[PDB]
Write a structure and sequence with these properties.
This protein is globular. The protein is built from 17 helices and 9 strands. The relative contact order is 0.16. The protein is an alpha+beta fold. Strands 1-2-7-4 form a 4-stranded mixed sheet. Helix 5 runs antiparallel to helix 6, helix 5 packs parallel to helix 17 and helix 12 (262-293) crosses helix 15 (324-336). The structure holds protoporphyrin IX containing FE and the ligand CC[C@]1(C)C[C@@H](OC(=O)CSc2n[nH]c(N)n2)[C@]2(C)[C@H](C)CC[C@]3(CCC(=O)[C@H]32)[C@@H](C)[C@@H]1O (2 copies). Residues 96-97, 108, 271-272, 275-276, 279-280, 283, 339-340, 343, 403-406, 409-413, 416-417 line the site of protoporphyrin IX containing FE (HEM). It is classed as oxidoreductase/oxidoreductase inhibitor. The entry lists the keywords Inhibitor, complex, binding properties, oxidoreductase, OXIDOREDUCTASE-OXIDOREDUCTASE INHIBITOR complex.
Length: 465
Amino acid sequence: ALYGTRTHGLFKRLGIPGPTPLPLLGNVLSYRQGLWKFDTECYKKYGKMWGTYEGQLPVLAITDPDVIRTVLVKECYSVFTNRRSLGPVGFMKSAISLAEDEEWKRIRSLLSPTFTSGKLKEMFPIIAQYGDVLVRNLRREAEKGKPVTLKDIFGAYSMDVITGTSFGVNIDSLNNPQDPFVESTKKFLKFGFLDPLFLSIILFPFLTPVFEALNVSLFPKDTINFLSKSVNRMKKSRLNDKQKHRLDFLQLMIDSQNSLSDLELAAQSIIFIFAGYETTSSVLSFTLYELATHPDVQQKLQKEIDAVLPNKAPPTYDAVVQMEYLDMVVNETLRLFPVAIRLERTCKKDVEINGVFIPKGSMVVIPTYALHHDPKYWTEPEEFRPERFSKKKDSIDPYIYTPFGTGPRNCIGMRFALMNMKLALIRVLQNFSFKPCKETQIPLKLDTQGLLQPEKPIVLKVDSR
Ligand code: HEM
Ligand SMILES: CC[C@]1(C)C[C@@H](OC(=O)CSc2n[nH]c(N)n2)[C@]2(C)[C@H](C)CC[C@]3(CCC(=O)[C@H]32)[C@@H](C)[C@@H]1O
Ligand SMILES: CC[C@]1(C)C[C@@H](OC(=O)CSc2n[nH]c(N)n2)[C@]2(C)[C@H](C)CC[C@]3(CCC(=O)[C@H]32)[C@@H](C)[C@@H]1O
C-alpha cells in the first residue's frame, strides 16, 4: 500500500536475485559509488541477471549476448524503442535522443545524412585544420618542459571540431581560454544520480508535470539560453552569408524549415554539443594515458603512423580510417573506458525476457562496463592490449563490446567521433611522445559522479620528436 514500496517484491516474486531495496529510494543510493562499480559488484555477486529498483522503477540487468541481441536489435521497434523517461526537460523533449517512438524515427531519419561516408570525407579537412592548431598549441605547452593537463587542450579540440563541422563557424576554443561553449556543458547534472532535482524525479515521478508547468528542467537554464542564442546567431549568419558553405548539420535542419521548428532545431544542436564534447575529450585523454603507461604500444603505434605517413605527411581521410593498429588502440581504450558506462531501454509494454515476465515501463540495463571488464570474455581484462582487436583474431561479439551501443538506437555519431579522435592522435603522435611524470596518477582512479572520468585530471609529460 505504501507509496514507497509497491513494486519492491517484483523480482523476489520472479525469482530474480538482487540487492534488497530501501523504502522510497530503492537501490538508487548504491549508485553513489559509481555506476561502473555498482554494476560490476552486482554482476560478480548475482550472476547473469539481477534486478534493482530506482525508487519504485524495476530495473532488470542482463548479460547474456543472445538476450542482449533480443533487446537491442530484435525487439527494438516493438518493445525497447526508447531509453529512460528523464523527466522535466522542456523543449529538449524534441531532441533526437530524448524523442520517442515515431517522433524519434523521423528526427533520426532527418539527421542521419549528416554522417554519410561522403559527408565525413567532405568535412575531414576542417577537422585537419583544428589538428594543426592542436599540435601547435600542444608544442607551446610542451616546450616549457612542464606537464600538460590533457582535458584543457583536448576538450578545446573536441569542442572545435563539433562546432566547425556542424555549424560552419570557427569559435576557436583552442586559442580562446574562457570558452563559453565549454563551460556551458559543465553545469549539467554535476552530481549525477545524487542531483537533488533528478533524485526527486526518481523518487516522485509524478512531479514531472509539476516541474514542466514551472519551467524547471534537468538542463541548466543558463546553458540552454546561451546555446539557443548562439545557434540562432549562427543560423541568421548562415541565412545572410551570400557566399558558399557546406551542406552541414546546420544547413540540413535549415532546409527542413523552409519546406522542424526553431526550438526543435536548437534541441538537436544542444544535444550534439553535449554528446560530442565530453565523450571525445575523455576518450582522447584515456588513450594518451594508456599510451604513456604502455610505451611499447605508443612506439609501435608511432611506427605505423610513420610507415603510412612518412616524413610527417598530412593524414588523409582514407589513411586515418584504415590504420589497423590505430583502430585497435582506440577500440581497446573504449573497452577499458566505455564513458557511458551502460545502455538502457524501457519496456513500452509487457514482455518476456529470458523466461522472465517484465511489466510495462520497467527498465532493462546492459552493463557495458561490467561486460567490458569480464574475465569470462577477455583475458586479463584490466590489461591494455590492443591485440585483442586484431583482425587475425576471432570477431568481437557486438553485444559484449558496446561502447557505442547496438541496434537502431546506437550512436549516430560513432564514425564521426572515431574520425575526430584518430585524426588528433595521429597528429600529436607524429610530433610528440607521452610519458608519466610525478603528477600523473598511476594507476588511474575513477570518479564516482556522472560520465566515466578520472578522479584527478590526467596530466602527462609531452616531449617533441
Ligand atoms: C567516443 C565518443 C562517443 C561515445 C562513447 C558515444 C557513446 C554513445 C552511446 C553508448 C550511445 C547510446 C547508444 C545506445 O543506447 O544503444 C550514444 C548515442 C548517441 N550519440 Fe554518441 N558517443 C560518442 C560520440 C558522439 C558524438 C561525437 C555525437 C554527435 C556528433 C554523438 C551523438 C549521439 C546521439 C545523438 C546519440 C543518440 C542516438 C539516438 O538515440 O537515436 N555521440 N552514444
Ligand atoms: C546530453 C545528452 C544525453 C542526455 C547524455 C549523454 O551524456 C552527455 O552528452 C554528456 S553528460 C555531461 N556533459 N557535461 C556534464 N556536466 N554532463 C550520454 C550519457 C552519452 C555520453 C552520449 C549519448 C547519450 C545517449 C545515451 C547516453 O549514454 C547519453 C546522449 C544522446 C543523451 O541524450
Ligand atoms: C545511459 C547513461 C546513464 C546510465 C544515464 C544518463 O541518462 C541518459 O543518458 C538518458 S539518454 C535517454 N533517455 N531517454 C532517451 N530516449 N534517451 C544520465 C541520467 C544523464 C542524462 C547523463 C549522465 C549519466 C551520468 C549521471 C546521470 O545523471 C546519467 C550517464 C553517464 C549514465 O551512465
